[PDB]
Amino acid sequence: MISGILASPGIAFGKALLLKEDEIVIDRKKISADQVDQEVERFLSGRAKASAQLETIKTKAGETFGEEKEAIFEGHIMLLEDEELEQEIIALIKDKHMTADAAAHEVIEGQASALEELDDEYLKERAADVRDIGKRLLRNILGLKIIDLSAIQDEVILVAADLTPSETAQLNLKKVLGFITDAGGRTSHTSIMARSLELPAIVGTGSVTSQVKNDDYLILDAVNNQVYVNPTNEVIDKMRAVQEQVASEKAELAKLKDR
């Protein structure tokens, strides 16, 4: 079947919520000196909103997990406000006649690749987290729609190949019944949420993200390390009784202490 790494015990039932994102496309058209002024406004002005959005998330990381994680997000903000990167990005637009989205991606292309050459869990993770900062800037300059994961109204299971610390830091723990992703690794941030929250979870799904679609009915067994896809009603009744029978057994244990 599908055997994952089992993060925490606990049976849960819910629909599959797949997170689908459209790839970002960069425009490589060369602009004229007349539109160059517009690129700087979108860039300088974009930082106005990006600095604010990233700044708000920074607090969520501290109010959600504690000051220990808040320091990591504070460092990312320093990169965006580095006066050094600003001069380089501005020069590329005016020197190479590149669009703000195009010039910005070039700088981000080397910042991420450079961090990958370091063999440290902190610096390496910074490579992936830094790339995320560039994606946020690109999404704001083009006015791309932003997915608000905190606006979920139906409790369901969250399924994704992997979540980045920023997305996990802003995830709403009250609207998600559990997490099931295909990132079985000690460095998987999703696994860390499960250990601190002890909520039932799995990460070594392997390739379930490539075999399930949003709205699929999934049962998390968190007992024998197996997930059921498209289970029959007869099978659902069998699993529903096992988890529920456990809750009733706890009440009976209180009466067995007097004999």
Coordinates of C-alpha atoms in Angstrom, one line a residue:
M1 CA 0.0 0.0 0.0
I2 CA 1.2 3.6 0.7
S3 CA 3.6 3.4 3.7
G4 CA 4.9 6.8 4.9
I5 CA 7.0 7.6 8.0
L6 CA 4.2 8.0 10.4
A7 CA 4.7 11.4 12.3
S8 CA 2.1 11.0 15.0
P9 CA -0.7 8.4 15.9
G10 CA -4.4 9.4 15.4
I11 CA -7.2 8.3 12.9
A12 CA -8.9 11.2 11.1
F13 CA -11.4 11.4 8.2
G14 CA -11.7 14.2 5.6
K15 CA -11.7 15.2 1.9
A16 CA -8.4 15.6 0.0
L17 CA -7.5 19.3 -0.4
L18 CA -4.8 19.5 -3.1
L19 CA -2.8 22.7 -3.4
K20 CA -2.4 23.6 -7.1
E21 CA -0.3 26.6 -8.2
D22 CA 0.1 28.0 -11.7
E23 CA 3.8 28.3 -12.7
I24 CA 5.1 31.9 -13.0
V25 CA 6.1 33.1 -16.4
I26 CA 8.8 35.8 -16.8
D27 CA 8.5 38.2 -19.8
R28 CA 11.8 38.5 -21.7
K29 CA 10.7 41.4 -24.0
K30 CA 13.2 44.3 -24.1
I31 CA 11.6 47.7 -23.0
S32 CA 12.5 51.2 -24.2
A33 CA 13.9 54.0 -22.0
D34 CA 10.4 55.4 -21.8
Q35 CA 8.9 52.4 -19.9
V36 CA 12.1 52.2 -17.7
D37 CA 10.6 54.7 -15.2
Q38 CA 7.5 52.4 -14.8
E39 CA 9.7 49.4 -13.8
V40 CA 11.4 51.3 -10.9
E41 CA 8.0 52.3 -9.5
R42 CA 6.7 48.8 -9.5
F43 CA 9.9 47.7 -7.9
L44 CA 10.3 50.4 -5.3
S45 CA 6.5 50.4 -4.8
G46 CA 6.4 46.6 -4.7
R47 CA 8.9 46.6 -1.9
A48 CA 6.4 48.9 -0.1
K49 CA 3.8 46.1 0.0
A50 CA 6.2 43.2 0.1
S51 CA 8.0 44.7 3.1
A52 CA 4.6 45.0 4.8
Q53 CA 3.4 41.4 3.9
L54 CA 6.7 39.8 4.9
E55 CA 6.8 42.0 8.1
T56 CA 3.3 40.8 9.1
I57 CA 4.2 37.1 8.6
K58 CA 7.3 37.6 10.7
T59 CA 5.1 38.2 13.7
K60 CA 2.9 35.2 12.9
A61 CA 6.0 33.0 13.1
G62 CA 6.7 34.4 16.6
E63 CA 3.1 34.3 17.8
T64 CA 2.4 30.9 16.2
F65 CA 5.6 29.0 17.1
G66 CA 7.5 31.5 19.4
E67 CA 10.3 34.0 19.2
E68 CA 12.7 31.1 18.3
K69 CA 11.2 31.1 14.7
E70 CA 10.6 34.9 14.5
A71 CA 14.4 35.5 14.2
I72 CA 14.5 33.4 11.0
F73 CA 11.9 35.6 9.3
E74 CA 13.6 38.8 10.5
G75 CA 16.8 37.8 8.6
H76 CA 14.9 37.4 5.3
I77 CA 13.5 40.9 5.6
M78 CA 17.1 42.2 5.8
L79 CA 18.0 40.7 2.4
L80 CA 15.1 42.6 0.7
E81 CA 16.1 45.9 2.5
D82 CA 19.9 45.4 1.7
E83 CA 21.0 48.6 0.0
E84 CA 23.5 46.5 -1.9
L85 CA 21.0 44.3 -3.7
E86 CA 18.9 47.4 -4.5
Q87 CA 21.7 49.1 -6.4
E88 CA 22.3 45.9 -8.5
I89 CA 18.7 45.3 -9.3
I90 CA 18.2 49.0 -10.3
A91 CA 21.3 48.9 -12.5
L92 CA 20.2 45.8 -14.4
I93 CA 16.9 47.5 -15.4
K94 CA 18.6 50.7 -16.6
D95 CA 21.9 49.1 -17.7
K96 CA 20.6 45.9 -19.5
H97 CA 17.1 47.3 -20.3
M98 CA 15.4 44.4 -18.4
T99 CA 11.9 44.4 -16.9
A100 CA 11.6 44.6 -13.1
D101 CA 10.5 40.9 -13.0
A102 CA 13.3 39.8 -15.3
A103 CA 16.1 41.8 -13.6
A104 CA 14.9 40.7 -10.1
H105 CA 14.9 37.0 -11.0
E106 CA 18.5 37.2 -12.2
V107 CA 19.8 38.4 -8.8
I108 CA 17.6 35.8 -7.0
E109 CA 19.0 33.2 -9.3
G110 CA 22.5 33.5 -7.8
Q111 CA 21.5 34.2 -4.2
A112 CA 19.7 30.8 -4.0
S113 CA 22.4 28.9 -6.0
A114 CA 25.2 30.3 -3.7
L115 CA 23.5 29.1 -0.5
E116 CA 23.1 25.6 -2.0
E117 CA 26.9 25.4 -2.1
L118 CA 27.1 25.5 1.7
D119 CA 26.6 22.2 3.5
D120 CA 24.7 23.6 6.5
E121 CA 21.0 22.9 7.4
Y122 CA 20.5 26.6 8.3
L123 CA 22.3 28.1 5.3
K124 CA 20.9 25.4 2.9
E125 CA 17.4 26.0 4.1
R126 CA 18.0 29.7 3.6
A127 CA 18.6 28.9 -0.1
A128 CA 15.0 27.6 -0.5
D129 CA 13.5 30.3 1.8
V130 CA 15.4 33.0 -0.2
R131 CA 14.0 31.8 -3.5
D132 CA 10.5 32.2 -1.9
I133 CA 11.2 35.9 -1.3
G134 CA 11.8 36.4 -5.0
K135 CA 8.6 34.6 -5.9
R136 CA 6.6 36.9 -3.6
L137 CA 8.0 40.0 -5.4
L138 CA 7.2 38.5 -8.8
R139 CA 3.6 37.7 -7.8
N140 CA 3.1 41.3 -6.6
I141 CA 4.6 43.1 -9.6
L142 CA 2.4 41.1 -12.0
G143 CA -0.7 41.4 -9.8
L144 CA -1.1 37.6 -9.6
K145 CA -3.9 36.3 -7.4
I146 CA -2.6 35.2 -4.0
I147 CA -3.9 32.0 -2.4
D148 CA -5.3 32.7 1.1
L149 CA -5.0 29.4 2.9
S150 CA -6.4 30.9 6.1
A151 CA -9.8 31.4 4.4
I152 CA -10.7 27.7 4.5
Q153 CA -14.3 27.2 5.9
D154 CA -14.6 23.4 5.7
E155 CA -12.3 21.3 7.8
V156 CA -10.4 18.9 5.5
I157 CA -7.0 17.2 5.2
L158 CA -4.2 19.3 3.7
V159 CA -2.2 17.4 1.0
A160 CA 0.9 18.9 -0.8
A161 CA 4.3 17.7 -2.1
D162 CA 5.9 20.1 0.3
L163 CA 5.3 23.4 2.2
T164 CA 7.8 26.2 2.7
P165 CA 8.3 27.6 6.3
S166 CA 6.5 30.8 5.2
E167 CA 3.4 29.0 4.0
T168 CA 3.4 26.7 7.1
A169 CA 4.0 29.7 9.5
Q170 CA 0.8 31.3 8.1
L171 CA -1.2 28.1 7.8
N172 CA -4.3 28.1 10.1
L173 CA -4.1 25.2 12.5
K174 CA -7.7 25.5 13.4
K175 CA -9.1 24.9 9.9
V176 CA -6.7 22.0 9.0
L177 CA -7.4 18.5 10.5
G178 CA -3.9 17.1 9.7
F179 CA -1.0 17.3 7.2
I180 CA -0.1 14.7 4.7
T181 CA 2.8 15.6 2.2
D182 CA 5.4 13.6 0.2
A183 CA 8.4 15.1 2.1
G184 CA 9.6 12.2 4.4
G185 CA 12.9 13.8 5.6
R186 CA 14.3 15.0 9.0
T187 CA 14.7 18.4 7.3
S188 CA 11.0 18.5 6.3
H189 CA 9.4 21.5 7.9
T190 CA 6.0 19.8 7.8
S191 CA 7.3 17.1 10.1
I192 CA 8.4 19.7 12.6
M193 CA 4.8 21.0 12.9
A194 CA 3.6 17.5 13.8
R195 CA 6.2 17.0 16.5
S196 CA 5.5 20.3 18.2
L197 CA 1.7 19.9 17.8
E198 CA 1.6 16.1 18.1
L199 CA -1.3 16.2 15.6
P200 CA -1.7 13.0 13.5
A201 CA 0.5 13.3 10.4
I202 CA 2.5 11.6 7.7
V203 CA 5.2 12.8 5.2
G204 CA 6.7 9.9 3.3
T205 CA 3.6 9.6 1.0
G206 CA 6.1 9.1 -1.9
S207 CA 4.0 10.1 -4.9
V208 CA 0.4 10.4 -3.6
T209 CA 0.3 14.0 -4.8
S210 CA 0.7 12.6 -8.3
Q211 CA -2.2 10.1 -7.8
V212 CA -4.9 12.0 -5.9
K213 CA -6.9 15.1 -6.8
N214 CA -8.6 17.7 -4.6
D215 CA -11.9 16.5 -3.1
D216 CA -10.8 12.8 -3.0
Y217 CA -12.0 11.0 0.1
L218 CA -9.0 9.8 2.2
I219 CA -8.8 8.1 5.6
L220 CA -5.7 8.6 7.7
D221 CA -5.1 5.5 9.9
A222 CA -2.0 6.8 11.8
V223 CA -2.0 3.3 13.3
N224 CA -0.6 0.7 10.7
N225 CA 0.9 3.4 8.5
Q226 CA -1.5 3.2 5.6
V227 CA -3.9 5.6 3.8
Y228 CA -7.0 4.4 1.9
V229 CA -8.0 6.1 -1.4
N230 CA -11.6 5.9 -2.6
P231 CA -12.7 3.5 0.3
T232 CA -16.1 1.8 0.1
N233 CA -18.9 2.7 2.6
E234 CA -18.5 -0.8 4.1
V235 CA -14.8 -0.2 4.8
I236 CA -15.5 3.3 6.3
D237 CA -17.8 1.8 8.9
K238 CA -15.1 -0.6 10.0
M239 CA -12.5 2.2 10.6
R240 CA -15.0 4.5 12.1
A241 CA -15.7 2.0 14.9
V242 CA -12.0 1.4 15.7
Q243 CA -11.1 5.0 16.5
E244 CA -14.4 5.7 18.2
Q245 CA -14.2 2.5 20.3
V246 CA -10.9 3.9 21.7
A247 CA -12.6 7.0 23.1
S248 CA -15.2 4.9 24.9
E249 CA -12.4 2.6 26.3
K250 CA -10.8 5.6 28.0
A251 CA -14.0 6.3 30.1
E252 CA -14.2 2.6 31.2
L253 CA -10.6 2.7 32.4
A254 CA -11.6 5.2 35.1
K255 CA -14.0 2.6 36.6
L256 CA -11.4 -0.2 36.7
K257 CA -9.3 1.6 39.3
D258 CA -11.6 0.7 42.2
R259 CA -11.6 -3.1 41.8

